[PDB]
């Protein structure tokens, strides 16, 4: 069950609007958090994300994610954020600058190269340099809003980079 | 085993109008072997957005399109099951979401939706057959008449006849 979430390591979420519902429980592992979220039982809301507090072994279930108005991502070394993929927009607006989904495959079907790897291709698109852009794992991204939309470096040493095939939100009626 | 992560349409395969589009096929044992390969995208010269398992010919058919892509049509067959990769089924709403085909099946306050084909807990005349094109399948949140509220379902709570589901607008600035 865990993947169906995008994991952000060392991250939690804080609600500003205190009318947004929340539920917590001390649990054993993050997997048990995911299962409760996925099946959505005993939660008076739609579970869109949860955080696992690894220190207190606490599970925090939310009817929002990091793209919801009124919630701040924050660093915290004992937290992992998990976001339900159904609520991360899986289609691109324009050039796809704001694309944060988990597609990690190019249009000709090649598995993307992790941004934190210089094999087979070396590059100056570091996760560190480029904040807010979510150059995490091997996801298709478009950090500079360039023509063909979200892309990646390719695990194939003979294709430096290729765009992925993420649909426009305007593709289907 | 990733098969449970796809949206399943029973008794259905997909046909190419456009002869240009590409397909990969392979003889296998079970439907989850189609799923695993689609999810991993290994050996596919394209992005796998759907697959068909042919239960009579014991074949996977992997596709770089789904039932929504232009130049493709559904075809009936008792032997076929269609599995659509949720990453390529728009998970946000345009307008009132008359066209929404995602798989969210819980209401705003966390109630599991009642199946459209069911009259339990609630009786209604939103029969799938009366509402064609509107994909009133399983217990998914739908807005078959295009009303102000966005997608909704009859609720599995006898106390709550129906409720809106909480599905994000693709774009609202």
- Put simply, the chain B residues between 31 and 70 with a CB less than 8 A from any chain A CB are 41, 44-49, 64, 68
Provide the number of structural domains found in chain A.
2
> What would the two tokens of residue A3 be?
């993947």
> What would the two tokens of residue A41 be?
């039982």
In SS3 terms, chain B reads as CCHHHEEEEEEEEEEECCCCCCCEEEECCCHHHHHHHHHHCCCCCCCCCEEEEECCCCEEEEECCCCCCCCEEEEEEEEEEEEEEHHHCCCCECCCCCCCCCCCCECCCCCEECCCCCCCCCCCCCCHHHCCCCCCCCCCCECCCCCCCCCEEEECCCCCCEEECCCCECCCC
Q: State which approach was used to obtain the coordinates.
A: X-ray
Contact assignment for A105 to B47 by CB distance below 8 Å: yes
Q: Which residues of B76-110 are buried (b: 16+ CB within 10 A; e: fewer)?
A: eeeebbbbbbbbbbbbbbbeebbbbbbbbbbbbbb
Q: Are A94 and A161 in a shared domain?
A: yes
- Facing residues of A161 across strands? A153
Domain boundary among B89, B106, B124: B89
Contact assignment for B41 to A107 by CB distance below 8 Å: no
- Optimal mutation site among A64, A91, A140, interface B, most CBs of chain B within 10 A: A91
State the DSSP code for A114: P
Distance from CA of A52 to the nearest CA of B (A): 21
Query: Is the Cα torsion angle B163, B168, B169, B170 positive or negative in sign?
Result: negative
Distance from CA of A51 to the nearest CA of B (A): 18
Closest-CA residue of B relative to A41 is B110
Q: Are A102 and A141 in a shared domain?
A: yes
Domain boundary among B89, B122, B153: B89
CATH number at residue A35: 3.50.4.10
Look-up: residue for tokens 């991360």? A88
- Find the domain containing A38 and state its range: 1-88
In this structure, the strands spanning B50-54 and A23-26 are unpaired
Q: Is B51 left (phi over 0), alpha (psi -120 to 50) or beta?
A: beta
């Amino acid at each position: 069950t865990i993947h169906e979430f995008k994991k952000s390591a060392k991250t939690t979420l804080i609600k500003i609007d205190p009318a947004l519902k929340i539920k917590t429980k001390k649990v054993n592992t993050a997997d048990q958090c995911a299962n409760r979220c996925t099946r959505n039982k005993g939660l008076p809301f739609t579970c869109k994300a949860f955080v696992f507090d690894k220190a207190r072994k606490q599970c925090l279930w939310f009817p929002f994610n990091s793209m919801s108005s009124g919630v701040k991502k924050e660093f915290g070394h004992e937290f992992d954020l998990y976001e339900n993929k159904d609520y991360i927009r899986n289609c691109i607006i324009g050039k796809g600058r704001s694309y944060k989904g988990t597609v990690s495959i190019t249009k000709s079907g090649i598995k993307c190269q992790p941004w934190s790897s210089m094999i087979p291709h070396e590059h100056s698109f570091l996760p560190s340099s480029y904040r807010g852009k979510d150059l995490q794992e091997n996801y298709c991204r478009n950090p500079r809003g360039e023509e063909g939309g979200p892309w990646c470096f390719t695990s194939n040493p003979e294709v430096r980079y290729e765009v992925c095939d993420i649909p426009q939100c305007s593709e289907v009626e």
